[PDB]
């Protein structure tokens, strides 16, 4: 039986748990209720096991995807924020924590890819994907490349494939329709064709992965890369003066990166649901609460409007939120498993020449809607 009268919180060690513990100390000073923060190893596997038996922490911090299967198994309590509180967070973040039409977690941090560029090689980054080939030719005259990013994972190539019309699943009535998949439509084909053309024209290499691109950008060999907030800390500022901006448009449409959110859910078996709501809404999700966590380990962009407006003074964060608002919420349904593997295979096969773009996407589409 989860202990009544206190709050136990589980979060991954990658986040600012020491800072969250500080918010917990404030809560105890105001209410007399003790808050304990833990970061167990293999948390994503441990929570489902303990919660299934009605045990575990009162609050669990994870990724919203994010397949609805903590929610699918009913491990999370439906949350009850009033309208005044809902108005305090960006609308799209609430969509990220809704499963089958019901809110099952509080959005904390917001993640989306952005365009990272070297200010010394490219003082003015391209606003369009279409101008990259010409830019690469000019930079290659100096032994540099225009753009290098991970082409092995769909997460990184999706922004371009979705720009002119591609999408995972149609979202209607706070619910995903697995019968309407947008992987082989005109937009997706146009985007993947452009990516493949970049490779056939030698502007990019099909074998480029995360580490190769990161090293290239860090050594000043490439003018641009595409990555998320998690990568900023590893950029070699002793060699590179970088900027972060909105992703380029394709066919005049904004690139649409998948948008993810760090979410805080309440254990369906907790006898402290009201205390948990009080802590999350009135302590953590306040300018003071987020700052405490942020000062420990930066969150990047956040769902709370008032604090994001403050954080946005950092152009890298401003860019992250701009791309997030133009992006596609990452679906949290079980069918997403099929999407990731099918699209990964399609992009790899199209880039390698093993399959044409049209056939690669048709096969992925057919596999997903199976």
From Swiss-Prot:
InterPro entries: Maltose/Cyclodextrin-bd, SBP, SBP_1_CS. Keywords: Periplasm, Signal, Sugar transport, Transport. CDD domains: PBP2_MBP. It is found in: Periplasm. Pfam families: SBP_bac_1. The keyword Glycoprotein does not apply. GO terms for molecular function: carbohydrate transmembrane transporter activity; maltose binding. Belongs to the bacterial solute-binding protein 1 family. This is Maltose/maltodextrin-binding periplasmic protein. The gene is malE.
């Amino acid at each position: 039986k989860i202990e009544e009268g206190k709050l136990v919180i589980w979060i991954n060690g990658l986040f600012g748990y020491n800072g969250l513990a500080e918010v917990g100390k404030k809560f105890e000073k105001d209410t007399g209720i003790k808050v304990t923060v833990e970061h167990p190893d293999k948390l994503e596997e441990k929570f489902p096991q303990v919660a299934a038996t009605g045990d575990g922490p009162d609050i669990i911090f994870y990724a919203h995807d994010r397949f609805g299967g903590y929610a699918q198994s009913g491990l999370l309590a439906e949350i009850t924020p009033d309208k005044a509180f809902q108005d305090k967070l960006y609308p799209f973040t609430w969509d990220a924590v809704r499963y089958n039409g019901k809110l099952i977690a509080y959005p904390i941090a917001v993640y989306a890819l952005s365009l990272i560029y070297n200010k010394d090689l490219l003082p003015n980054p391209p606003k369009t994907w279409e101008e990259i080939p010409a830019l690469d030719k000019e930079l290659k005259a100096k032994g540099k490349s225009a753009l290098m990013f991970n082409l092995q994972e769909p997460y990184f190539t999706w922004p371009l494939i979705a720009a002119d019309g591609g999408y995972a699943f149609k979202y209607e009535n706070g619910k995903y329709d697995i019968k309407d998949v947008g992987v082989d439509n005109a937009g997706a084909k146009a985007g993947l064709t452009f990516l493949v053309d970049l490779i056939k024209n030698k502007h990019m290499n099909a074998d480029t992965d995360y580490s190769i691109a990161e090293a290239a950008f860090n050594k000043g060999e490439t003018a641009m890369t595409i990555n998320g907030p998690w990568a900023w800390s590893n950029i070699d500022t002793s060699k590179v003066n970088y900027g972060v901006t909105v992703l380029p448009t394709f066919k005049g449409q904004p690139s649409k990166p998948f948008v993810g959110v760090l979410s805080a859910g309440i254990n369906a078996a907790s006898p402290n649901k009201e205390l948990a709501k009080e802590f999350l809404e009135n302590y953590l999700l306040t300018d003071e609460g987020l700052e405490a966590v942020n000062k420990d380990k930066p969150l990047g962009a956040v769902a709370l409007k008032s604090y994001e407006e403050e954080l946005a003074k950092d152009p890298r964060i401003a860019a992250t939120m701009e791309n997030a608002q133009k992006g596609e919420i990452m679906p949290n349904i079980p069918q997403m498993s099929a999407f990731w593997y099918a699209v990964r295979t399609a992009v790899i096969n199209a880039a390698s020449g093993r399959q044409t773009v049209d056939e690669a996407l048709k096969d992925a589409q057919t596999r997903i809607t199976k």
